Amino acid sequence: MFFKGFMFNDERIDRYFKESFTLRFLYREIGRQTVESFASQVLYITMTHEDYIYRV
């Protein structure tokens, strides 16, 4: 749903990043009207900062 088919090559990096994402915003409400727009925004933000995520 949220990161639509976007997976980092390393398994631990992927698991920790997505666990942090789903833990930080567990009870927060999506900003946009629908889940597709929110998913697109999340995917864009992930793709743009993929290198920083990898290094960090």
Binding site: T48, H49, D51, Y52, V56
Partner: protein, 55 residues
């Protein structure tokens, strides 16, 4: 009575060639902080000019 004569000719030619290469990588945290918004900065110029700005 003894005489003599000598003669020599020594001729040397040489060639050298040295090919030295290197590669140094320094890791600093200051570079990671500057890394953050390089990709995002692309679409701030796209949004400013090409798209509508009022809801």
């Amino acid at each position: 009575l003894r005489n003599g004569e000598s003669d020599t000719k020594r001729n040397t030619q040489s060639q050298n060639e040295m090919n030295r290469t290197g590669l140094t990588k320094q890791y600093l945290i200051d570079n990671l902080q500057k890394l953050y918004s390089m990709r995002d900065t692309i679409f701030k110029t796209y949004d400013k000019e090409c798209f509508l700005h009022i809801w």
